[PDB]
Amino acid sequence: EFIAVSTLARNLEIAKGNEFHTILATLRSPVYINEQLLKSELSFLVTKILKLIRSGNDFDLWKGCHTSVVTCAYNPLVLSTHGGQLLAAIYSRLEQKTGFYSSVISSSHGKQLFNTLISSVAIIIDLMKNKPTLSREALVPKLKAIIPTLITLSQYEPELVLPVLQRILKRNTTTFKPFTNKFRTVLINLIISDYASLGTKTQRLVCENFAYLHLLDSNWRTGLMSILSQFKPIIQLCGEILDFEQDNELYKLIKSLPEFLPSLKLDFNAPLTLWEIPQRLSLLADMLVAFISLPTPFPIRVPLGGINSLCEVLLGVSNDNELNGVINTILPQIQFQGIRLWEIMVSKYGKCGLSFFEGILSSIELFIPLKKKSNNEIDFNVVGSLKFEFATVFRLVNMILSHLGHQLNIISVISQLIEVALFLSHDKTLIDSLIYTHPELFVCKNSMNWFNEINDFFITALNNWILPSTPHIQILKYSITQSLRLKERFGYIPESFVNLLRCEVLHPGSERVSILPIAISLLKNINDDMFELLCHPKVPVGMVY
Amino acid sequence: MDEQVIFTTNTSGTIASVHSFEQINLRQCSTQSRNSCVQVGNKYLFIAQAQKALINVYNLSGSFKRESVEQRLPLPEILKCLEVVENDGVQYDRIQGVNHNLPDFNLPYLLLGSTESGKLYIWELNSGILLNVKPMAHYQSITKIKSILNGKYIITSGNDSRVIIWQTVDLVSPKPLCILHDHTLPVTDFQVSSSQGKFLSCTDTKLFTVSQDATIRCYDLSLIKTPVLLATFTTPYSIKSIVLDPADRACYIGTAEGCFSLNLFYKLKGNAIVNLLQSAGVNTVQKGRVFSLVQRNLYAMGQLVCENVLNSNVSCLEISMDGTLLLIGDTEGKVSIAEIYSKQIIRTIQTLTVGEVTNLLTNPYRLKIPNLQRVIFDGKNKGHLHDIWYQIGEPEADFNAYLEQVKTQESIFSH
């Protein structure tokens, strides 16, 4: 019946994996909430855990914090009785173990130790927020001393600490107040660094925490407009090399735009130093994304026309020897920071900004690299580098057409994007400029996780447009050939191609004849129920009574 | 890409693609049966010989196909009919998608084979094990067997004018589900809709049945119950064979003195178009309409206009993946590739080395085996090890993810 929790406690001071995991697993059971073991047996377990955490060989500590986490999560009485004492012990060990950091990270287990301690503190103070009476008198006299330690530790371990301070700053905006300057310093020291040794997650977290720093109606607006105003100097610095006023409607808009960062220097004899310009614009875009896409405890003014104008002027930036070669690569990356901002302005706000959904699609044509000589032809060698960016473009288009829907008039950007997507759907080879008797082994074959993205884009195109003939026949040939190839290689057809053939059957558009019976010939032993309804239709849905 | 025709006469084994004008005559083949050939596991072709009591096995995977017999398979009895139950739903790895390639060794689960006097032999193919033998199912013969869904149900037809629907789990571990006596003379063929679902409760699956009674009977299959017919037609000529369009838009019937067509979405003289086959799930009336066919030389009299395509004494029919070409086998041992609309032959395939076209097949394509056990039955033993031969097949095996790995890596160094 009952597993005698004293037995778990006494077998816990020594327990390796295949015993310790059973101890943690059986302690989930709710029958340890019951009369007259609530003052004499849980006390024994908690004193055992406390003796494990208070002094140990750094294995009993890891074991102990995991044990307290599981116990407090699956038993609210242990929380309401002893959570303050457990959290005090864990914070004390964290404090002594972060008083030194370069003698505690010396053995490849200090990192995991900080991970488990920080995670355990976070989990405890994420369960003591559903109890007002308990968030008093166990956390609030302790956060004043918890938070400076976490700040000092975030200088070295931002990937692990910053979500905790983010949640604490968000749920408590009045105890983080007198430490706020001390936080800001470290965040400017983490942005003044190279800022590419940090991951995307860490970059986003420092941006988000700097954004939530300004919670202390109006300060959010000041920080937001400061970051928005730090865009125009960089663009005018880029305008001394692209020679604007060749097109004046752009230069009218550039001067129509409205601080801790260094004013940067550029040298043309060292063209690699031109990689500072994208690596500042991406930074400011991340900070802007943080100020915009985050939740708040109050509403906020967000300028949408301003950032739309900013995105519009970013994608206008396009068309001694190696310098020209380096200029031919930074500019797509510059445009992509307009793409990356419209993708967040679209999904998070949705139909707000419906007015801008037609200009974005026209401006995406500027992102496409054309051949240099005079022509409207696509430069496929540049497109081979830009794969992730064009995937982001495809997701942006699919985000827009969820709201716009089917479109009467057609535009030219979609046909060029289809040509791009059909180029990217071909198995790349990188020996074409020239063997060793086998040039077919030097290919980069396209996974199915990429074909899914391409096929979702073609679904969006065939749904909402009556396309021209040749950009339709290419799609049909692609779908049929690849489906047959995969049905030979495999014994089946993946689901994205089936969805593509479904859309090709349902939405033929300008065609005078469907591809229905060929889809069924391919779907011979892979049956599906869409075409049953099409060929063998059903009685309506209310005739039955 | 192109389509591939595998047809065999009583003394000839030709294989040829439709748009290639190249062909391979298999050396040793003999048949006097209507449907006796099958293509097994995209690596093999099985043909049941006549008057030898064995199956010939040809390897058809090569770039230069094996003209000769790759292998033989003796049997207990000479048997006429064949059908295969293809294994599906094993290559995706539904637990997590890895999209396994096919192995070099693949096989189906079953090999249905039926002989004269109505006996049915079914064999596991991964290991030759005769799981079950039904001594008598039809009481004169069997002429065609087909698995309509993947391995779920199989349908049989013989010369007792009864078409039987089994259930594969109730046949291999028999008491069939339903029997169909609506014909009076031997049922020579049937066909089922190429468009199908995963189940029968939410589909209306059409079964066309054809006999020497000069009738064509269209049955609605949706059970959960018995099937209900909703139309039957009638013919002046002794009908022999039948195929459908790949979407159940038409019917094409092969018979003595020509091959005839029939539109199922029948267009009247008001620009009014009537679907003869309308139905639902299990709720459906039993009032099967009657109509009669008459050639070309408006339907409330009980007559319908079939359009004559050809004048050849056809034995068998098949259809292309487009749904626009018929491949018809005459009694002079040659195939005609014809176009449905214009009624103009485009190609004529003969064999080179004679009897009629026994059977033929088509599927599109792009540019050892166990011995069968003669009278042995795997019983209710549990200590028996039901060993099979099997192979799984490898799974299919960018840069921004690599750079993100690099960015996460760089933080650990203080240098």
Binding site: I473, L476, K477, I480, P508, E511, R512, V513, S514, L516, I518, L534 | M1, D2, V18, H19, D245, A247, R249, A250, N263, F265, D322, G323, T324, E339, I340, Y341, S342
Partner: peptide, 24 residues
């Protein structure tokens, strides 16, 4: 007129070029 019916012209699906082989 209807896309999902048998058309009234002889060679449909000739403009998809599935079965053609281009000469090089």
């Amino acid at each position: 007129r209807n896309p999902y019916l048998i058309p009234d012209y002889p060679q449909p699906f000739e403009h998809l070029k599935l079965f053609t082989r281009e000469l090089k």
